[model samples]
Structure formats: C-alpha cells, structure tokens
Target: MLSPKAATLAERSAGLAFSLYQAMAKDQAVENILLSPVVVASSLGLVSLGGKATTASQAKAVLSAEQLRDEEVHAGLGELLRSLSNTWKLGSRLYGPSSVSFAEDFVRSSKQHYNCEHSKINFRDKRSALQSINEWAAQTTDGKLPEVTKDVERTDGALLVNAMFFKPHWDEKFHHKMVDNRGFMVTRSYTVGVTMMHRTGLYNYYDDEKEKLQIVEMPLAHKLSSLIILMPHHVEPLERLEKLLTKEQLKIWMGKMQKKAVAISLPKGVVEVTHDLQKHLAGLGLTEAIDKNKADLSRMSGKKDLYLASVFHATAFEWDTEGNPFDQDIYGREELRSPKLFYADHPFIFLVRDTQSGSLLFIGRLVRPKGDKMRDELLEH
Candidate 1:
C-alpha cells in the first residue's frame, strides 16, 4: 500500500521510466549500459518498490534478457543520451566512466556489464574518478553540484562508475536562526548542526485519513519544472505516511494538490546516504552480482576478473537564495535551519529526474549523502 505521497511518486517515476525506456531503445550507449554490468553509482541507494527501484530493475531485466548485436551496443548507448539531455531545466546530470579494454572487441563486448570489475578506470585516484563524474555533473547542472566521482575499474574487477546527481528542494523554507547552533534529530538518536536551506512558496498541500500531506515544489531555473516534496502532517510523519499510504490514497492525494503561497518553512539540511551496494542489491534481486557462489559474470572479464567493489551516494542542499538566477525561493533564509512543514530531520525519499521524460537519474532517501562509505570517511560528495 502506498500512502498518497508514495503513489504520486510512483506514478511520476513510472512515467519517467516509460519515456526513458523509449529513449534507451533509441540510444546506443545507455541501452548498452542497460544490457551490460556497468552500474552508475549514487549515494541514494536503490529506490523502494514503486519509485526508481522498480523502474531500473524492470528496465534492466528486459535489457538483460535481450541479446543485441555488438553494433547495437553503441547505438543503444547513443539513444540513452536522451535520458540526460531531456531535462536540464530540472537541473540534473548523468556522469560516470566507461572503461575500454585492451582489445576493441572487448570494449564492444564489455558494454553489457561495465561496472563489473573488468571495466578498469583510466583516471587517477578513485576520488578523481568521482571528481570527473562530479565535474561533468556540475557542468551539466550549471554548477549546482561539487565535483564527485568514482572509478571501480581501478581494482581490475568491474568497470563500475559510481555517481550521484540530484535536484530536490522542500515545499517550505525555514529561518536560518532555527537551524543555527541547534541540532535536528536523526536516525542515530542524536542531533547535529548542519547547513540547511530555507524557503517559503506555493506548496502542494492535502490531507487524508492517514495524515495531512503537503507537496513542496522547488523550481530549478524554471517555473514549469521543479523538485516536488511530499510530507505527512504529523510528528511521526514517516511512520504515519507509511501506515496510511495505499496506491489508491496516493492517487487521490496527487489530485488534491493545490498551488498557493503559505508561511511554510523547511529545514536547511542535506540527507547523506552511502553504502557498498553489494549487499543492498540483494533485496532487489541483483543477487547474482554479489553472491560469489553463484555469480557468473565471466563473460565480462575472462577468468572472473569482475566483481562489484563499492557503491557510494551523497546529496548536499541548503535553500535556494533569493538572488539566485532562478530565484525559486520566496522567503529569505533568516536562520540556517528551522522546523518547517518539510523539515527532513528523519529519513525521507528523494529523486533527481529529467523532467522531459520524467526519467529518474538517481533516487534514494537521504540517511546522509555525505559519509565514509565510499572507502573514505569523507561526506562532502
């Protein structure tokens, strides 16, 4: 059962996936990625059943089952480019490295599983790989993200490229003073002061038997395309939202959204999530990639020189500034962070998608986008 919020998100994600699949069927590179072992990394792990999780898995399953010609790999990858180019106004990027083999045929053949050990990173430090990924993402996003990248091929196993791209803002903005020295609560049973974004704008609001729901819209350099925020109207919003969410309720909630400026506030904090991904994938049925016992990716790298080394995800955000070129924020940041309708002190879902096709580049709940899970204790990514 999806709370109204989850249902609405699932619908959007589904739409995005359908369009993205059409784009992939047309593109060569990305379509190759779908067939191969290469997985783009992100701090936000695999989404739940409805959101991007189902979209990616179903799409990949279809790709994996099909056997395209070698020439088709390039064509598939090429058509996939539409996924990223389709939505710059929403502020997003698709960044990652594609490894080349000693043999040209190997390069062509390796597209099916680029992230599996054999891909090999041609770049410097693993951080540098992330930097390159971030650089491209930043360029694509118009400087909204700091450069962050990772090259898994450095291990001589998988030519995996880890990346994270996001564009999300709260439906409400908080006063900086509220987020000042004070700390917001978290899963670890503690509070810490963190940089937070503040804002007030016309939010999508609704309420039902489960909880009062509000959808916050964050404009990304445009009025038509904006990051949508969904929150339950209660102290234990996460729990309440989860309990009340049903596929039908979600559809109703989306239909009830109204546009209006409110004295709303959101916290100025970033959700950081980092994980090795080897284990997390088991839930989504990617067991073959990690289960050493049954894993059979030898087709990618002869002698089984391929394995998933690591997966890291990070997301950092404050609030939109009043003077931003887009000027999406309506209320000024009086304090760095404060209690608001969209205060994300606890875990909350998020997404970075191309508005054109509604295709999601990344999706995950921000436990913390900055963390040491990328083999380093650094969370700045």
Candidate 2:
C-alpha cells in the first residue's frame, strides 16, 4: 500500500501509460508492448529536477499534469517509490561519466525526491561500464534479467536506466501441465499452440456495454496488486477494441468491476521488453533536454556540454499458477450456480496496477504469443 498522496500520483502515471501505449501500439510489428509506466515517469521526473525552463516543463507535460508544481508530483511519487512493498521491484539509477562533475544539490535532491541512485563510470571504458550495469541489473531484479542494456554508445555522456520485474501467480491457482497445449489466435486466421491455464473464483469483473468488452481484475496472491484483463466480448477482433483506450476509460472500467464469479481460461503469458527511450523521449516532447545544441542542464552540473544520451527502461512479467488450488474451491463452485465464462484465447490488453493506490505499474498487450508465452514443440521434431 502507498500513502494518501499516491492516488493522485498514480493517476498521473496512468496518464503517461496510455499516452505511451497509444504511441507504441501504432507500429504493427510491436507484437507485445509491455511497459511499467511508474518506472519511466519517476526516473524522468527525477532527472527533470536538474533541467531548466522548457526542458523541465516538457517532462511534466508528458506526465500529463503540467500545472501541478514539481513538489506536488515529486512528493507523491517519492512516497510511492519509497513505500511500496516487495511485490513490485521498482528501481532507478543514473550512470554518469566521472569526467564531469554533477551538482551536489542535483545528486542529493534526486535521491530524496525520486529515490534515484547515482553511480560513476567513464564511457572511455564502455565495455567494463556495460558489464557493471548488467551486474547491477541482475542483482536488482533477482537475476531475472542477465543483461538490460546493450546499446550504450561509446560517445554517450549519461545513461539513465530503470527496470521493473514482477511475476504473479493466480491467487486461486491454475495448475496446468507444461506439456499441455491450447491454441491461441494471433490474427483472423493464424494460430499457435500455447501453455494455457485456468481459474474459477470470485473476482472484480466488469462487462461494459458502451466499451463493448469484458474486464476482470485478477488479484495476485496476498491481494496487494491486481492484473486487470480487458477482453473484447467474445473473439471480436482486438483491433477495434484497442481504439477505446484512454485514462477515463481505464478509470471507469476499473470502477465498474463488481464481485462476480468467473471461470477464466487464459494462455500463460511471459513477456520481457527492453526499450531505448531515445525516440520515445523526443516524441513525448522532451527534446531540449536530450538535444546536443539546445539543452540547458546547467542545474545538473557546473560543467558545460552536458546532455542526456539515452534513457533505457525495461519491464518483464509472467502469468501462471504455482500453488495448488483448494481441495474444494467452495467460493468458485459451490456459491455460484452459473459462473461467467471469460476465455482469453485471443489478443487482449492487460494492466498490472497497484490495488490500493491504483498506480499503473505495467500495461501490455498480448497480441501474438512468441518467446516463452507459447511452447516450442520443434524440440521433438
């Protein structure tokens, strides 16, 4: 759980989530667009403190709450980053060249406001520096990510890295065999065999009329965070439904989730997306700070020629069951005579959000399961 101010912060992050979602989802080749919006917003929010004029304003603008003072956003986000439990492993760091001297105030305030840590490494030894970064990444994520960055240019001055790793098992349990397979629809006709799982329980479910979709808030074990799945009614193509994404739509859909018994059959999902936010940052109106000619990072250092090189963010998530179901799921089978059936065998959108503060932890679309989301039966061939 987060502090009282975290709700407002969560809303702001949600705004960024959809903003980037619509932008990233525009490209058809992006089979799965996974993002932990809280990580990006906080890491950038931390660095913007060292920016001047439009450099700063643009960051706030991308957060979608420009009028709110920096203190307002920072305080709420600071509470959020510092307060969340171990269920969400959120981390941020700035790797700067020791060749340049950063302002003492900027370094101190970043740690205080955004929980950002700073480290020193010269790009002159980019090879060793890269290994050091991966070392930190491996430990921070409990070894889930062996390497988080590979595009660190030799000429780059500063590197900003943010990462989040979360794997949640179904609270009610869906113990499906690894060898078992279920067909998953990728497009109108294409199909692939995937590891499918199932669960039946009382959930916070919503079937929206205007939105024309089914939403289910599937809480993980301990009920601190929930992975909400928004499925188009039946196998209706997600193409049309993807157009209905908005912060307002998200809030209403989340609010409408009433307690209902549901039988959910969803293919096991495993997605790890590592992104270089260089283009995304410029696209989000944060050009000046990263610009070589026009940047004013004077607040960051007493030195000149200082500008951001790249912002690297990575997020990974998996959905499956680990625990055995109750010997008798009374709430699932006994209490409800007719449970609503929710079959997510096709493309869909899902969001991992904090239940208490409602922060948008991660948002992703499973359009086509590749990688570990499906099985590779060629081993037998």
Candidate 3:
C-alpha cells in the first residue's frame, strides 16, 4: 500500500531527475552523464526536514518541490526512499567533525525517516572525514558500492555522503548467443564499438514519431526495476531531446507503450559515476547546504559554523543478460514479418525505475559513453 505522500514524491522526484540531468549535461566538459537520482533526492529531500527558514525552501526549489509543502515533501521522501528493495541499496551518512556533535533530534529524525546512519570524525586528520565515510559505505552495502568519498582536500563543517549500488538482471535475459559487437555512433563525427544485445520479442514499446523517438521498456527479474530506453531516429545537428524531456511528458509516454513484439538492439553493460555536485547544484538555486557563509542549519545545531561541506554521491549498475530466449528460432525466417527494428545504435536517453511504486531511479544519456565494470578498474589497476 503506497502512502499518499509517497505518491506525491513520485512526481517531484522525477522532476529532480531531469533537473540534475539537464544541469550536468549543460557542462561542456561532460561527455556522458550518469547518476542515481533517488540517491541524491533522498538525501537532499531530507534537508528540508532539518533546515531553517530559507535553507529549507532553497532545497525544495532545487528538488522541484516548490509547489508542495515541506511536511508533504518530507513525508513522501521518507517513505519513498525506504521502499526500494534489494535490487538497489541506498546507504547514507551525515558526517561532521568531533568539534561539535549533531543535535539528537536531527539524528533521531533522520534515523526514523531514512534509517540513515551518522558518523563524527576527528578533523586533525582532515582526510579522516572522507576516509571514514568511504569505509562506512563499504560496510553498509557489503562493499557492493565500496566507496562514496575519495581524495577530499578539505571537507569541513558537515557533509552528506550517499552511496548507491544496483545489480539487476533482466526478466528476459539476453543469452550469450544474442550478444554481438556492433557500432554505436557517439555522434556523427565520433563512433565506437559496443556490446550489443539483440532480441526479437514482446516489449512495451512506443514510437514518438513527432520527435523521431522510440521508447522501449525492459523489465528486470524478480524485482520492480525496469529500464526504459529513448532513442531518436535522426541525431539532429545538436541534441534536442535531452532538453525536451519533462516528467509530465514522460508519464504520458510511459502509458503509451503497448506490449508488442519487436527486434530491439541495445548497448549492454554497466556504468558507474561518482561526483561532488555542490557546484552544479547552483544552477538549480541550491547553495545554503554547501555554502559556508550563507548556511543557517539551526535545525541541526546551534553551531553557527555548521555548513554542508560536500554533496558526495557514487552510483553504479550492471545488466548481465545470462538466460536465453524461449524460442528455439526467433524471427524464424528472413520473413517480411521483420519486426519493427528498434536499435540504440546512436546516442539515447535511458531510465531505470521501480515499476511497482513508480519511482525513478537512474537517468542519463549514452553519448560518448563508456561501460566500465568494477573489476575492470579494481583488478586491472
């Protein structure tokens, strides 16, 4: 049974997903963007629970929660975040220096709302801030996420660290036989090879002809998770679809997809991205949390020096298509029943969500993207 409050967050959280995606994409240095929205949303949304005056409103502004009251947003975020099950894990920590301890009320509230953990570090060993946080994450997620903080120069005041790890299998796994190496055009001027998984089967599909876009839904096994891919037929001079996206339009498209058989070619792999989002969030009008001079987090403590020092997030996901298709011969013949070809042979927008409660998880575009697994870095390095 979904709470009315959780339902409210369902809409705004998606708005924040696009908000973060658009902000990062605007950066010319970013080739491809990837992050788990709920990780950020769950942490940021709770700030409203402990922020004073404008600090709370600024957080709401960034989260696209301006229309909803603080109580509603908090109630929704609290329940909505805790609902995502084993397919994904959100382990967070609120860290501060030993100079001052967090107020019991704030810690207890966050604990009750998110089951979130807390930690205090000795600042003399300044690096201990992130070091302890990183190790704590490893313990919570059973080392699945391993690290949420790395190479921190100075993380004074307080920092919000969120670590998310996701390992999901497809309801219809793409067996090794269905996998092939194919070309994915990063853009008209750039191209690269990718692990392409092909399947000719029933899918919740929709073709947005107006935008030359095709949307396909791939459900994950034994879980509420689902991956939705949005690929455009013609990559126009610049990318237009990224800017054209909105959660409202997305809800319509979500319903538009009707189950039908098709031949879909997808880039199959894992993507892990870590970022300190304080600077980027300025575009969304959120600063008090990270701004030392302007922050007034009296809700957490009476210490005037307290400020949110960092907004650290690390997220990763993998899709291992190990099982085979039911049919002995898919699209049996070179017949004209040549299913509608839906190939992600170019840049596209993709989203992974919890279908049961309708929560948006991961959102990003695969343009000039690289799929690097954990072992690739841990073992090879």
Candidate 4:
C-alpha cells in the first residue's frame, strides 16, 4: 500500500504524462516523438517551489499536483527521485547570471528536494556558458546527449535544464539471428524498409476490442520497469487513439493486461527527442510562469524581475531486438513456450514506465521507422 501523499503524487505524475502526450499528438507533423513528462514537470516543479500565488498555483496544476500542498508535493518528488536513483540516470541544474542572486531557501530546497546543483555563470558568454552546461549534461547521460541547446546566451534571465537516460535490456533478450528486413507502414500509401527484431515469450497482453487498440507489456531486467506498447487496429486511427488517452484509461489498460504467450516483432531503431515545452506548457494553462511580467518566481531569486526563460527537455532511447552477437547462443537459454503473434510493422506508440511508482520515464511513437527527420532535427541542435 502507498501513503496518501505518495499515491497522490503517482496519480498526478501519470495524469500529466498523458496530458502532454495528448497535446503533442495533435500536431500531425510531430509523428515519431519522445518526451519525459515526469522529468519536465518535476524540473518545473522545482521552479514552482519559489513561485507565489497564481504562478505557483498554475505550475501545480500543469504538473497535476492539485491534491497535495507544496511541502508534500516537493517531498514526494524527492522520494520518487531517490527510489529510482540507482536504475535511472537523471540530472537537473539551475543556472543564473553572475549579477543575479538566488533566495537561500530556494537554492537549499532545490538541492534537498531535486538533488539539483546550482551554477553562477556569465550567460552573455554563449560559447563558454553552453560548454559548461553541456558538459554536465553529457556526463549525466553518459555522453549520449552531448549538448542541451545552442540558444543559451542571454544578458539576463535564468535557465532550467533537465536530462534523463535509461537503458534496460529485456528480461529475455531477443535472438539476433531472428532479425530481418521488413517493410513498415508509415501511412496508408507509404511504407519503408526497416530492420525488425523478433521474440516469443509470455507477456502481459490486452486487446481493447471496443477501442480498437492492442497493448503488450514487456518487462526489463528490473522487474518493476516495463515497456508498454499501444497499437491501433487497422480500422482505428492513431489520432483517435491518442485522443482517447487519459489517466483512467491507462489504469484500465494496465489492469486488463494478463500473462499470455506472444510472438513479438518490433522495429530496431534509435530516437533522440528534445521539446522546448514553452508552447505546450502554456497550452496546459501555465501562463504566469513563462510570462516575464506577470510571473512571480521570487522564491528562485531575490530579484523581483526574475522569471522562467525556458524549459528544455531531452531524451534518448533505442530498442534493438537482437541479442549480443558475441554472446553464447541466447535462444538456448530460454524455456520452450508457445505464444500467439504480436507483429508491429505499422505506426505505433510505446512508453517506458516504472511500475512501482507509475512514472513514465519515456514515451514516444514510431511513425516512420526508416526516416531520421526527427532524429536529424534534434541532432542539429
């Protein structure tokens, strides 16, 4: 059983995650996208600690934290970070200009609750400032993400950046020999060739006939971490499926999943996504925080004029179905079992989640598996 505060935090986290995904899904061009809603929300939640009145209230609502007070919400976030500290690589930082000053309590709370480090830098020196922040970002994510963003130079204002990286192998690794080139349907008229990995095992599966959706849950090395894949049936549109998402709907799908033998084929590719989150935050009713005039982030800095400048979030993930080629025969180690088929050769959505906390570590869609437009766009930054 979870404490009331913990349970509330979990519910809010799931709610906010789905809400962000729903908003992003509305943009058709944003196919094959990725985001860490918990990471982004908690990073801002740290900022909300220093907010007052409308600014604070809006931040809480955007984070889906209406049920808990400030203390409980921050404490709950702190506990959630510590709980997954060992398995996930997470990093956050608060950067302010050298001329600016931060509230002692705000800085202390940031360190205590978010485990975030603070830096006093010359924001005007774009090159050096970006280099320093990117160094920390790279270190935290094992060099997977070398840079956060290039638009870091400013004579005034502050910056809040967050990064999360997680790589967990399947409980039963896929055999490399089974990998084959297959065509993936990106749209009704277009298809592209992609490398597909195959595996057969017992998985938690659910087929939502009424909603025209199919879900498959695959556990990672850690029993508590799992990847939940959502695929719309041929007659059901992806847009409709995304619109139907909600905290309650997700909870229902989770409960409906039952252990069943399944043969799975998933695309083998990598995705790196970065979202500015300014517009999306505003769309979610977080107006004051981003507004330079109306925003009240007095708790963050003693300067009455200080306001949030930007919210940057970056994530990298890949699922290669093939097991290590150099290792001993992987297929020889698995137990023989018969399972039904679950092929994923069409556009679909997936999320990596921590079951214990019900936190979404990463959520994304694979609209064009063979295309790198999204990946290229993120890399150019």
Candidate with maximal TM-score: 2
Candidate 3: give its CA RMSD in angstroms: 5.3
How would you encode candidate 4's per-residue C-alpha lDDT over 54-116 as one tens digit per residue? 888888777667767899888877876666666357788877788887888888888898887
Of the two candidates 2 and 3, the one with more favorable TM-score, higher being better, is 2
TM-score of 3: 0.81
TM-score for all predictions?
0.54, 0.83, 0.81, 0.82
Total backbone clashes of model 4?
Answer: 0
Q: Worst 10-residue stretch by lDDT in candidate 3? A: 372-381
lDDT of 4: 0.74
Compare candidates 2 and 4 on TM-score and give the better one.
Answer: 2
lDDT of 3 by residue, 1-381 (tens): 468767766666777778878888777776666677666777777677767888888888877677887767777777777666544667778777787677888888888776667788876775765568778777766666666555764557777777776766677767677788876776674567678888777788898888778888888775467888888886542257876678878889989988777787877776556677777776677777768888777887667858877777776665456543455566646542657788777888888887777778788776764643222223443
Which regions of candidate 1 deviate over 4 angstroms? 1-78, 85-103, 106-156, 165-182, 187-189, 237-251, 269-272, 309-347, 352-356, 367-381
Quality of model 3 by C-alpha lDDT = 0.72
Q: After superposition on all CA atoms, how large is the RMSD of candidate 4?
A: 5.6
lDDT of 1: 0.37
> lDDT for every model?
0.37, 0.74, 0.72, 0.74
Where in model 4 is the C-alpha error above 4 Å?
63-69, 121-129, 150-156, 181-183, 189-193, 209-211, 234-237, 254-257, 321-339, 356-361, 369-381
Whichever of 3 and 4 has more TM-score, that candidate is 4
Error of 1 at 348 (Å): 3.3
